[PDB]
Design a binder for these strands. Structure first.
Ligand SMILES: [Mn+2]
Ligand SMILES: [Mn+2]
Ligand SMILES: [Mn+2]
Ligand code: NA
Ligand code: NA
Ligand code: NA
Length: 324
DNA sequence: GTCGG
DNA sequence: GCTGATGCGCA
DNA sequence: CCGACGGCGCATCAGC
């Protein structure tokens, strides 16, 4: 938080662009500026100082001058005052309500949590869950509870099949002290990039975790991806419900998978751009040599995380050093 | 909104 | 009833 | 001045 005041500003602007203006590239432009400024090891004294940073341009430098001078931004004060903008922004905080649903709701006079629960009939399954757990989903998960959650997932998965490998990635793996949710990567020897797709590989793990009442609600579920809600067991105080994502990936692509889902978000954006800046298209499933004409070769062999870094000549970075 | 064509 | 069109969330 | 900025699995539902 050397520059927390400025990064907060940029993030609020990013949010407005995505949620209200539905201008996704501006949204990303703002998050990119916020990321480069949060990594900047000095306290910013002016817009021109920030303008030296890649991702920070003319308009943001000026916004930075104003904030530094006035401690606020006029544009954001107006937005906050605007009823439509404010309400649309707010509704998107519900999991399942995006920019489109939010705007539609607001145009119909539906603009509060209260309005939402008064209109359950206009909500789909995922949005009802989102509404149901509104507060819970905005809470962080303390590492101590993440460790507890880890134990249960790994142990129930073993129970289904001793050769499954489940790895909790995301902020947890980076060693964060709180996480926004739990992301689990799942593998099994019988599922590889060749394979045949024998179904229920993921279903078996979801069913079991449901069986021990750890998973409490499903938002989406297919043969490779589960998105749902879970809760640690408790006269004592009930734990908050939490978001859990489970992804089943071909075993021979484990490391590209783990690398990607260990993140961060911006870090993986940073990784792919620089990747092509050395003749590779690193993605979530493979690393391939690229081509001037546009041909990416077959997936290079990968047997470790580090293996991936070597290819792309980045200084190795531990899970912890990947937040952006 | 920003940066490299 | 079906499905092409679109929305959502997401490292 | 201008255009690229990553893409996909899964759920819903308007328009047939
Ligand atoms: Mn997460
Ligand atoms: Mn997640
Ligand atoms: Mn279809
Ligand atoms: Na845009
Ligand atoms: Na700059
Ligand atoms: Na939302």
């Amino acid at each position: 938080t050397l520059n927390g005041g400025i990064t907060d500003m940029l993030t609020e602007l990013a949010n407005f662009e995505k949620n209200v203006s539905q201008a996704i590239h501006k949204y990303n432009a703002y998050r990119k500026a916020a990321s480069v400024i949060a990594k900047y090891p000095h306290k910013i004294k002016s817009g021109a100082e920030a303008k030296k940073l890649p991702g920070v341009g003319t308009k943001i430098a000026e916004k930075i001058d104003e904030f530094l001078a006035t401690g606020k931004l006029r544009k954001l004060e107006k937005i906050r005052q605007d009823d439509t903008s404010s309400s649309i922004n707010f509704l998107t905080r519900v999991s399942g309500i995006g920019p489109s649903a939010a705007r539609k709701f607001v145009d119909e006079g539906i603009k509060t949590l209260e309005d939402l629960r008064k209109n359950e009939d206009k909500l789909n399954h995922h949005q009802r869950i989102g509404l149901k757990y509104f507060g819970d989903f905005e809470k962080r998960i303390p590492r101590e509870e993440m460790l507890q959650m880890q134990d249960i997932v790994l142990n129930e998965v073993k129970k289904v099949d001793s050769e499954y490998i489940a790895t909790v990635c995301g902020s947890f793996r980076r060693g964060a002290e709180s996480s926004g949710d739990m992301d689990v990567l799942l593998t099994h020897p019988s599922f590889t990039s060749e394979s045949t797709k024998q179904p229920k590989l993921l279903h078996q793990v979801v069913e079991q975790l449901q069986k021990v009442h750890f998973i409490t609600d499903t938002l989406s579920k297919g043969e490779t991806k589960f998105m749902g809600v879970c809760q640690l067991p408790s006269d004592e105080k009930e734990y908050p419900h939490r978001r859990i994502d489970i992804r089943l990936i071909p075993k021979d692509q484990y490391y590209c998978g783990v690398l990607y889902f260990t993140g961060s978000d911006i870090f993986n954006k940073n990784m792919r751009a620089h990747a092509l800046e050395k003749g590779f298209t690193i993605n979530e499933y493979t690393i391939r040599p690229l081509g001037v004409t546009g041909v990416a070769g077959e997936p290079l062999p990968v047997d470790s995380e580090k293996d991936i870094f070597d290819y792309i000549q980045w200084k190795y970075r531990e899970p912890k050093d990947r937040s952006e």
